[PDB]
Amino acid sequence: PDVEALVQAETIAVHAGPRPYEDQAVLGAIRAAIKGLQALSFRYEGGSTPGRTREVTPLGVLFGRSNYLVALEGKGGKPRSWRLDRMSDLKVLDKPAPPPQDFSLQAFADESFGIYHDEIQDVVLRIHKSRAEDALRWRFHATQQVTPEADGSVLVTFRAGGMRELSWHLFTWGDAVEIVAPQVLKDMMVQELREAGRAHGAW
Amino acid sequence: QAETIAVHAGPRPYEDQAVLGAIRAAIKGLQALSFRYEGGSTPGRTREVTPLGVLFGRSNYLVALEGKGGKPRSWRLDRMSDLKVLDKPAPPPQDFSLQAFADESFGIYHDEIQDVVLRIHKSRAEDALRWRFHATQQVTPEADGSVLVTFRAGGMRELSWHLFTWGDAVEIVAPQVLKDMMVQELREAGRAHGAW
Numbered sequence: 001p002d003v004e005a006l007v008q009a010e011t012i013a014v015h016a017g018p019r020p021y022e023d024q025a026v027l028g029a030i031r032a033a034i035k036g037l038q039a040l041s042f043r044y045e046g047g048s049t050p051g052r053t054r055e056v057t058p059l060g061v062l063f064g065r066s067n068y069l070v071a072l073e074g075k076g077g078k079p080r081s082w083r084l085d086r087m088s089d090l091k092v093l094d095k096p097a098p099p100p101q102d103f104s105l106q107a108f109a110d111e112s113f114g115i116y117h118d119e120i121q122d123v124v125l126r127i128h129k130s131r132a133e134d135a136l137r138w139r140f141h142a143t144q145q146v147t148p149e150a151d152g153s154v155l156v157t158f159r160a161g162g163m164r165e166l167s168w169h170l171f172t173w174g175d176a177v178e179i180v181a182p183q184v185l186k187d188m189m190v191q192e193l194r195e196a197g198r199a200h201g202a203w
Numbered sequence: 204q205a206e207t208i209a210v211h212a213g214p215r216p217y218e219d220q221a222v223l224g225a226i227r228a229a230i231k232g233l234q235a236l237s238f239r240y241e242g243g244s245t246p247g248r249t250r251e252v253t254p255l256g257v258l259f260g261r262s263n264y265l266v267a268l269e270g271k272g273g274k275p276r277s278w279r280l281d282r283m284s285d286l287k288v289l290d291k292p293a294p295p296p297q298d299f300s301l302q303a304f305a306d307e308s309f310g311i312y313h314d315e316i317q318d319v320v321l322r323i324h325k326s327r328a329e330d331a332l333r334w335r336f337h338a339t340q341q342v343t344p345e346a347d348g349s350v351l352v353t354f355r356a357g358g359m360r361e362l363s364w365h366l367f368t369w370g371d372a373v374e375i376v377a378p379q380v381l382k383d384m385m386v387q388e389l390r391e392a393g394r395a396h397g398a399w
Binding site: 001002003004005006007008009010011012013014015016017018019020021031034059060061062063064065066067068085104105106108109110111112113137138139140141142160162165166168169171172174175177178179186189190192193194195196197198199200201202203 | 206207209212214216217218220223224226227230257264281302335337361362364367370374382388389391392393394395396398
């Protein structure tokens, strides 16, 4: 697999700065369930039925600042991401739960910057010349294409879901990023900026 | 494929997979690691270290110590090259913790250490209780259901970026430098994106 995932799974790498409290016992239960080809049950403090017990076929773990279990809930259910920081009362069931042989975990991981895989967006950004070199060493997405423009800017294009999380990241680029598309990313960014600007007394 | 781990999509630095592989092999084998280090005091010099772990973030770092009795410190992955796993013993210090290093003073950040005081609105208080802002943090319920979060840390720039992810649910009580930074970044990004 990706070495970036490997070193985090092995606790050789940590994400600096604020992040969820996460219990290594939860990861151990998931790994044991996957290794044994067994079903996994847990209490999920999220979604419509908070505190309810869910039984899933676990498929893998997505590693990042927050970690996610990818799993199918019930025959006919789709691959879905569950945040590890909302999972408790893990039980490795004494029941076989074979995964599909077509599913690509790393393909699934790249569909979205967030929890939901609903609408993939065609994202187009323009990074101003002052940050252009940084942009050339920056991994926005696995699918990205970077194009130098005539004035020293770089265009960055990629396809992904998860616009809220992406707009949080774009804040870190300051005034050096222009959002070219999609409109929903512009509107999300502007609404978040107005909310936070009012709250902090920026204007 | 039998793939059971993956990296969540998230914008992040380019990272040389070979470099992480060499660091991981050195750490698992309890072996020393050598590399050319760009910049710093002796640019381009070959350094030999006891490797300890990796930090992901705004930039990626090796955590490692140099020389007998050396103190753990950070090295930028993007200034490292010519990695070699050596056949010398390099066990970690008996008291070393990667997560503690991640939170320790001047481990990666260079600004002044601040007393951070935040108030988080009731609508996100449950989330704040399950959130690890810093190892030194204390969270205190207020009578109106909000929570107070206090901690002592550097890295105000990175912290202000993270606070943007809490929206209108976080009030910065202190330090003033964090307030000012937050406001300046909001005004700049707001003007750039057309929000005011």
